[PDB]
Amino acid sequence: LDLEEWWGPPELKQKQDTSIKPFEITFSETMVKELKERIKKRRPFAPPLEGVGFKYGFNSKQLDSWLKYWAEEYPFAERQKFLNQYPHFKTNIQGLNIHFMRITPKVPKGVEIVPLLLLHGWPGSVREFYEAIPHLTAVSKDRNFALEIIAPSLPGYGFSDAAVRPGLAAAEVAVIFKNLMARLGYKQYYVQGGDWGALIGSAMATFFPKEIIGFHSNMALTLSPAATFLEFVGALFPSLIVEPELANRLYPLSEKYSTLLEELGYMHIQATKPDTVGIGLTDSPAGLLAYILEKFSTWTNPDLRSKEDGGLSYRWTKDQLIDNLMLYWSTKSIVTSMRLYAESFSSRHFDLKLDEIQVQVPTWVLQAKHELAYQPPCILKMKYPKLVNASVIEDGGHFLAFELPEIFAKDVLKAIGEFRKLKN
Amino acid sequence: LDLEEWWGPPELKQKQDTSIKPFEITFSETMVKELKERIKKRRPFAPPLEGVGFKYGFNSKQLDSWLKYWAEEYPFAERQKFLNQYPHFKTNIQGLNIHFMRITPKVPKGVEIVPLLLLHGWPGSVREFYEAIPHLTAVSKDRNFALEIIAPSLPGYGFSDAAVRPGLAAAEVAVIFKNLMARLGYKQYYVQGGDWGALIGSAMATFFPKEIIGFHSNMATLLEELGYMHIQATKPDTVGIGLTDSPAGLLAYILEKFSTWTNPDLRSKEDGGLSYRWTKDQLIDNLMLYWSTKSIVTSMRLYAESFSSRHFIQVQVPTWVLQAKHELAYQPPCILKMKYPKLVNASVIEDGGHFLAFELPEIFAKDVLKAIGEFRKLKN
To answer: Using CA atoms, how far apart are residues B257 and B264, in angstroms rounded to an integer?
Structure first.
């Protein structure tokens, strides 16, 4: 466990600027101009197969309306203002300039301010959290406390620097973020994560139980031999590990793995050849858009694969979705963002056996209807012996905070309430 | 086993044109100019990780030189002429205008002209075969036969039309090429293929044993090399869009394969090493039959169709197998007799990788001629 490992250019080790610098997101006019003309001068795309929807991936017929909107209608100036409504900063951790949002509520006497580290995954970003933030940071009067939020871009994502050498997997990111909270002055704090953030947050709780006082997860999953074996034992007689009302989230197993085979293509290629697949996505707005938006389709509700349009209007406006795309396009981070897959699937990282070391920190789990996978509390208790509760929603998918901001924030606050309650 | 199954736009079924028309490959000046501008207006790509070579996929330091060569040094008009040095044709088979090359030797009396169907895979094309052709079609005083070659573009590849509806997997392409050979007037022929060519030929010999009189196949760290297959088999339309729009993307995606499948150890090299076997012109030629035809998506769809529930037996035809040492799935000679009961020989070349005919044209042609020679001696 190396806490001082250097990920930036090696010559800057003795020239580390350790200050917390204020930062403005900007959509520069040359960038915007170049983007517009790259969309305008696009190529004709192979027509899709008729009546297939999204079952072969992004429907090319839908590209005209999205690209036209992006070039002509998307309000670049207004959106820059939208993104800057919160405070941004940068500070160098281990050679990397890490970006984070920080939202601090104003509080009446008798209300405690409590730090929460909020972690995004792929292909999301800090944009994911904007609509959830007013709820997360609100003062209530049913509550003793209010949340101060720190929300960093993962290294190689959004506005954070990427590693210059191999080795930066999820476990190493756990370290960078622990160092970040130390930089900012925090000794104890809560962590919330989904997708990668669930993985990285889980590792932080594993490594630093003294610092993490509670972990909330909306992507709770164990892929260990013991977990999978227990998964198969429950196929024999289900009422042993899972409730029948929840049984259809897991069973039959043949459904789970068939849909998993169909959907893990991106993950397979990103874990092996991220620099290859990422090159076209770096250069083409149409490519980036198709690749990322397909996820916002399927991972929200699998049944949307049937529809001709996505349906990418099911939950979000065009602007909300292009906001997130803009954090990939304007920073050129698609390749660096994909490398986390390659690093995390390493032999080295898997030999760390994260799925077999228990988290001894109080834990809360949120389980939306249409998450890509599900595990009952019985198997979860193996990785999280101090599991306080598993909150089950009958709605929502993978991008929970982005999709159901109110429901998300309500549940996170409820968790922290219960965490503070038990500490007594 | 539907022999009439229609794959193109159904309105053509009644008005079906069955003629064989000469076809010329062209790089239109507007396509060339758009490609040049698209290359010159280039985005700065994320730098590669320190000292890793091609281990994370295509190394982005190499992008400048490739793309600059393509834009400034690759002689488009001259390469178009090279590509038209052999006769090309188009004919409608089952609703699809299928492209093929046809090379006929000039033969004296006493020499039989024997037809060979030569099938390329992905991400190759009929370009793979070009320098093997002079040796394959050579008229020998020592031989009682000379080969005539038919080399088609797989449907949705190169200059052959894509299917307009789900279902066109390899087995269906076996049907189309059976009908192609009949349209050309051949009642019996030999088949050669690697990659998709091997699976299609295999299927051909399995379904129509009476017309395939000989089958030469050249496709008889692993998990690290399967990501392309997984995504193309499931979401070909997603991954394909970037590649249709971006010359850098297409070049990166295709050339990575010419690197690894030629020799897996070249993944360590900073450059590929994409200089190991071919000139830049040779590889860009193959790229052009993807770029200029906008066929990357349609070519990937073949994967999605073959890995379906509906798609997923022995060859009773004389069989020959040629094995490269640098191929991905090396398999012992004993398990080959399981798949091919009528296996005549299995040649093993210590040198060479996946793209055999393209990598080693002479050694390729020689092995094919020998196989066909032995085939003709069995019957008696």
So the answer is: 10
Cβ neighbour number for residue A324 with a 10 Å cutoff: 23
Cβ within 8 Å, pair A269-B231: yes
CATH superfamily entry for domain A1-424: Alpha/Beta hydrolase fold, catalytic domain (3.40.50.1820)
What is the phi-psi region of residue B278: left when phi exceeds 0, alpha when psi lies from -120 to 50, beta otherwise?
Answer: beta
User: A101 with A86: CB under 8 angstroms?
Assistant: yes
Q: What 3-state class would DSSP assign to B112? A: strand
For A327-396, the DSSP string reads: HHHTTT-HHHHHHHHHHHTSHHHHTT-TTTS---S-EEEEE-TT-S----HHHHHHH-TTEEEEEEPSS-
Which of A276, A293, A305 is best to mutate for the B interface (most B CBs within 10 A)? A276
Mutate to test the interface with A, among B39, B49, B157 (most CBs of A within 10 A): B49
Residues followed by a break in chain A (C to N exceeding 2.5 Å) are none
Task: Tell me which residues of A are annotated as active site.
Answer: 195, 341, 398
DSSP A292-323: HHHHHHHTT-GGGGGSSSTTTTSS--HHHHHH
Is A173 strand, coil or helix?
helix
Reported as type and span, the H/E element at residue B33 is: helix B29-40
Q: Which CATH class is domain B1-380?
A: alpha beta
Q: B99: alpha, beta or left, given left = phi > 0 and alpha = psi -120 to 50?
A: beta
Beta bridge partners of B281: none
Alpha-carbon distance values, B251 to A298, B141, B256 (Å): 29, 44, 8
The resolution in Å comes to: 2.3
Chain centroid, CA A108 distance in Å: 32
Chain-chain contact of B46 with A280 (C-beta, under 8 angstroms): no
Catalytic residue check, B303: yes
Which of B42, B236, B242 is closest, CB to CB, to A56?
B236
φ and ψ of B347, to 5 deg: -80, 140
Exposure of A157 in the CB half-sphere (CA atoms within 13 A): 27
CB contact under 8 A, A287 and B241: yes
